[PDB]
Symmetry: C5
């Protein structure tokens, strides 16, 4: 024969090739497909829908017993490229699919002179994963991707690994960083699946373990809270009888309610329930309500409503004791009868204002004591909250 | 003949096979397709659009009378794989479709040596369902999926079940949990459908009964309400004549209105109307309006506007009776003529302030009585609201 | 010949069949297609985009003169199924398309022994419609769907109806209810269309008349309005000189503005303009502004600013007349010289407070009169608003 | 020969037809395609993305030199229908594409007996346009659609017009109105395009000029502004020393800020910058700030802080002049020594209150003058704003 | 032979052409593809998803050794058009793909008489890019697009440039401006890629450098801030003892909080953290908190709570020194015994009011000093903020 080019080899491979039959000379021998995957980027994590969208570079190889030739008599050709849609291709899919991703089509494969067939392709995966958000800013997710043949049983198609699992799990080569998620590892494991007894299938499960970067949410959830706490603290400097303390506190409570309502949408709460962030927000709500109740009580105490005399049973241990326990602080007759009324009226006015002064002093002492108690409680809460981050970070 | 491989069997099956003709030797015998379905995950429930999106694993089998062979003379081959697009396939669809889902294509099927043809595929279903949200947090939905042939009548295609309905309905093997919906059951039923008389079709209806998990909405709808109720309760501690009580109440009402407006979007209301949650919110609105009206009335009562003498007809039964019914509490002439004016002015001032004091006492008594009544009403409402959850949960 | 099966009939129909030529023996005879449609569900009505999305079950039939056979010599076969993509199919589309819907493909059709060819398919339609929202909660929409051949003129393809128009228009058999829209009717009409003179086409127009259910918007637009009206009414019980009336009214106005802004997005306003709901909201705005202006005027009137004596020309007809027209309500010299100053100062203080009391009484009378007038106006407006719904509902 | 039907003509046209070669007998003659377009509906105008989405009905014709036949010997057939995918079709596209629209496929074309080939199809176009929003409510947009062959140069494919440009530009026959946009005209123009010297292409540019209907935004941007202006005007009726004027003004400013923030999203601002609507809103902001500053100044002026005597240098020209310039308005000794203190104290109290009264009168005069000035300024601004609309509308 | 037309040339090129084999006569010679790209429009920059969407016009050429002919004997034809799907086409893709864009298909290519094959097509690219937003309004982005063959190694396919890199980088000919992004340059670079040792591929990387236009965000982030600053400045004109200063300040703080919450969504914060805009906003928060604290302190100082005598140790250096350091400002006995009480009461009232006056003067002096200090600090901050823009712009 002549030597036109290598294309006649293709003819010798595809003159009478049937692409609908599994390529084995003995039907009792299963076709083994060796696969591996490299993660490229974590595209999306929908917590409320429990959906994970990722991108991978996937490659696989198997053996075709009808595509073998001698390199001699073909100008020492050892491998070539063949269109994908002209040979048998296994139907390897992922169990966890909930949608069909958009990925480009690769129309060529390699064939070697010993039946070695290799296939490279990129895949966009939209899978269903169970996400635990119990500790939302510092959660670690552990999803799974299970590769298996949808139809063929283990007697026809078996799945192995292209390379060792040790180098598969420690592989971060093309991964895209600074994208709110950090790829920890990808651990492979082989299994034999069977719902109903009579049919058994080969499955290769890749456990993808990833970790969230908390610094994205470290300023959107912390600074407004401490700002509202510090303005609450500075609000106590107003005197209780000024009259605008109650308006200040109710305005602050309204602002905090608006904040929590407008922020709770961005923090998902699914599965077992809300994360501990909701618990801490509820604690802040309780603290604000306690402060408002103390303000209401002291305003009620220092109010002027034609009060009675101050009670001695709550004066000896409230002014004297608290000073040391805590920080310290014929015509004549007509003239006299006329002037007696003026004198009596001025006396009763003076008595009323003296009673008001005593009640004001009692209220001031109580306000100072409650301010000190609230300040100590706030400091203790801040310390016991920051110690958790301190012990978590040093790990 | 020689023995190249099993592929010649495929040739013997596909040399002169026509895929456009229904595979029966006698045209009077219908082709029976036995199907079954396993639910995988509930993807979405759009209440306002009345749309249900689910994922299922579907499989079916039928008999092809032109794909039969003897296992002998073919190296004892009992079954093989054939491309799907080379044989006749029934057109089984779902009546309730409103859109086309994205599902992967399976290019292979099994064929056994007796004409047995089996087909496995995953399906994403976007169907139309009637959703009842009368009891929104605890609703149970009952949707239907009807499998039928779109064209062929019962004289051509008939539908049966692969396995017993008892094991079909009690099947939760691959279902994905912690996704806001719990799969209760899937009940199958066969029916003969016919709009117009002359044409009758076979239908297999699967009733999918699912239940919503209420704990997702148990913290987003309850804690703010009780928080606003408790701050309303603590707001009554302010004296009526302080002046900031009205501002406090109107600010609280504005906050509650903002809350209800910003939350009502997340609670759908369709079909028959709003759920009972709207009724309970309206009840809370009425309670808040009653509290505001009581505050306005008492502020009007205790106001100083140069009032008249206190009425005896509303004093004997308001102070004395309420104490026991409810909880208890030549130059001379010129000098006299001059001083008489001062005495009279001080007398009239004292009379005015005494009248004001009496009115203030009456207002305080009324405020205490209304506070007790409102507290009892709130307690009764809370008890009669929690008893419904108590009786519902223990079931 | 032998009798393998009916499939040879298919061969006899498809041995030398050309699917690119119109199936008529005489080219002067047009091909008549008889069609009909059953609505299934109204999917979406985008008012701002003027788009209607619906789902229909469509079927059609025509005559193929190259697909005729004798039932004898073919085992008395009268009809069979043929793949759709192997025969000629008319290009019937809808003029009003603005997008391509996603509908499943039906790969089979019936053929009878006289050339009768029937085709069933479901269609998702996304069309452009002119929507009138002049009376938004009670609007009735009248859209059109025009079926016609895109290329062939009336000399090639003509369109008729499968069944009588009377049974077409009175057909609600598979329609999905409780979906915010009620299907009133579907009226068909035939027409001959022609933009430019030389080309005339056959068109079949289905007028789809549907009606909106108002109860969906009967609680989202009515209860907050009446709630704000009733709190406005109860706000008048505050005395004009209390000082928090103005703050109450401005807070109520701010809340109403927030409500209208946050609700106007959900009410579309397109085409000719806003519905009458905007007019009624503007009327409510005017009423609230009138109430605020009355409050401002009365507060200005009852204020203490060292006023002059009360005017007699606005006292005789303001207190006396209004009572019946409306509801009723050597050293000596030094001592005298010294005491004269005190007497004069007390006299001028008493005169000032008497003037203030008179002005307060005038303000109270005016406030009562304006309150009665506003209450009557509100009652009249409510009656004349509810009478429209009363006369509309009983129809 | 016999006379089966016209289909043999199709055979005579498609026995040895090659659809991959340009249909010319001489390769030096370009293939001329005559096209035209009718707009159907303006679907979307994304200003921030600078994207225009439209729907058109497009048709074209050219000459195929291998599809000619004699009407005689073919039963006087002059034209017929041929599948689109069996003949050569030019690749005419639009330069401005940024996405692929979804349009139905038309599988048939006409062929006449002289090689005339005509093609009708609907097209959904998603193109990139430069939008100028300098005058946002009354802007006129001028977009372009350029039809050209993507590959073939002017030596192969040339583009002309099916009909005269005069009847093309004055064509509003199927356009959908009441959709926020009015189609003004569609002007065609031919051009020869060439980036790099060696290659020249034929282009047909259609300038689509459209106009926005302002009445859609005439109620969403005007009524709230005039409402806030009129409530600002009525807010001046409060006396300066009442105390709630400042709260009223700050609440109004907060409401206006909320309005502008919640509305500015719906008004896009791209390219050269914000439209004049932002300038007018800034003017309203400046007016409100001026009003607030005047209120703050007058409240500071009329406040009681133990002031000094009123200044004569700012009293002669402030009360007297403004009235005409603007609108007008042994024991004895002890007794005397004792009473002298009371007399002196009452004298100093009277002096203080007289000083306060004088300052209050000065503040009232200044408040009236500033109110008149602000009213005149508001009237002038309203007139000079409405005159622009008056002169624009009458054009 | 005869001369029908040029189409026989196509036959001579496609009689026995195999499109699945790489077109080289010697398999050891790689196929070189020369490519180039012209950017058309920047479609989208998703910062939170780190996604870049662009549109390009791409063209490439290579050599096909089986598509060569002599121009003579073919009527001097030098080049022609061939369908794309009938010849070998290299699989050149982009590494950074995360999705599949929608671009039109071009069904024709040129072939010259020396095997020259050219291919033109438009491409919509959705790629993953690392975006740095450290200086958000003035950021410059530097993305990469890497063209390479997905399967073939450098022994089969090699990539070069169609034209010189100098004219590639300085090419802005069809780019669409006024779209929030300015194209700075496109720099090409060749590289040899290899993850694992044994396989090496050719890559052509285009670095696309673009710049954001800040004027889009120059009015949405600056004018409200300066407006709130100027109203804060004018709020200091209120006297400290007026009573509405605290309400004014808390309302302003609530408005600023609402502004920052409603604006922070439109400013993304990803990767390394928030831009300096957040730092400047935090600085504004600190300034507002300082102003509020000063107001609270001065209101506490000037309040009347039955204070003690003014302290001399904080009066000599607070009134005298500050004036120069800063800007300046038997029966008888009964009658005497009776009148002594009145005299003493008036004396103590006068002493109390004198003490209040002294404290008010001290508070006024402190308020003026703090106002001057705050004004100077605000001016310094404004100058040191505007100097950065001044030095950045002149570059
Ligand atoms: O589809 C079904 C399935 C559906 C409906 C009923 C079923 N019974 N038993 C099974 C099955 C077997 C499970 N799979 C899958 C098919 N391949 C891919 C994943 C599963 C295992 C192998
Ligand atoms: O499409 C139609 C249909 C359309 C338009 C008019 C019609 N009259 N009678 C019918 C029908 C029969 C009902 N189906 C369906 C076709 N298969 C799937 C579901 C239905 C029953 C069998
Ligand atoms: O797909 C893989 C790939 C996947 C899974 C495992 C892998 N090991 N080594 C590689 C690879 C080689 C890298 N590419 C790509 C294939 N072409 C386009 C881009 C890369 C280089 C050449």
């Amino acid at each position: 024969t002549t030597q036109p080019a290598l294309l006649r080899l293709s003819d010798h491979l595809l003159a009478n090739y049937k692409k609908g039959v599994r390529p084995v000379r003995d039907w009792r021998k299963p076709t083994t497909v060796s696969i591996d995957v490299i993660m490229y980027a974590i595209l999306n994590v929908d917590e409320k829908n429990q959906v994970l969208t990722t991108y991978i570079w996937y490659r696989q190889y198997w053996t075709d017993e009808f595509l073998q030739w001698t390199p001699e008599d073909f100008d020492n050709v050892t491998k070539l490229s063949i269109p994908t849609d002209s040979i048998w291709v296994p139907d390897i899919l992922i169990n966890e699919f909930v949608d069909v991703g958009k990925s480009p089509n690769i129309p060529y494969v390699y064939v070697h002179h010993r039946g070695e067939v290799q296939n490279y392709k990129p895949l966009q995966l939209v899978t269903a994963c169970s996400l635990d958000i119990y500790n939302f800013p510092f959660d670690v997710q552990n999803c799974s991707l299970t590769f298996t043949s949808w139809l063929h049983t283990i007697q026809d198609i078996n799945i192995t690994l292209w390379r060792s699992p040790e180098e598969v799990r420690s592989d971060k080569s093309i991964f895209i960083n600074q994208g709110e998620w950090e790829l920890l590892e990808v651990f492979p494991q082989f299994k034999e699946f069977s719902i109903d007894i009579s049919n058994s299938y080969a499955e290769m499960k890749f456990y993808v373990i990833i970790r969230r970067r908390p610094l994205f949410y470290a300023v959107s959830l912390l600074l407004p809270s401490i700002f509202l706490m510090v303005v609450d603290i500075v609000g106590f400097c107003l005197p209780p009888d000024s009259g605008e303390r109650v308006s200040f506190k109710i305005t602050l409570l309204l602002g905090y309610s608006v904040f929590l309502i407008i922020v709770s949408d961005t923090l998902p709460a699914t599965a077992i329930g809300t994360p501990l962030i909701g618990v801490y927000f509820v604690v802040c709500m309780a603290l604000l309500v306690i402060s408002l109740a103390e303000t209401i009580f002291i305003v009620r105490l220092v109010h002027k409503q034609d009060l009675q005399r101050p009670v001695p049973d709550w004066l000896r241990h409230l002014v004297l004791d608290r000073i040391a326990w805590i920080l310290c602080l014929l015509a004549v007759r007509g003239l006299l009868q006329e002037l007696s009324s003026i004198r009596h009226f001025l006396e009763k006015r003076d008595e009323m204002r003296e009673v008001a002064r005593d009640w004001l002093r009692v209220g001031y002492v109580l306000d100072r004591l409650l301010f000190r108690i609230y300040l100590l409680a706030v400091l203790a809460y801040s310390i016991t909250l920051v110690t958790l981050w301190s012990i978590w970070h040093y790990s």
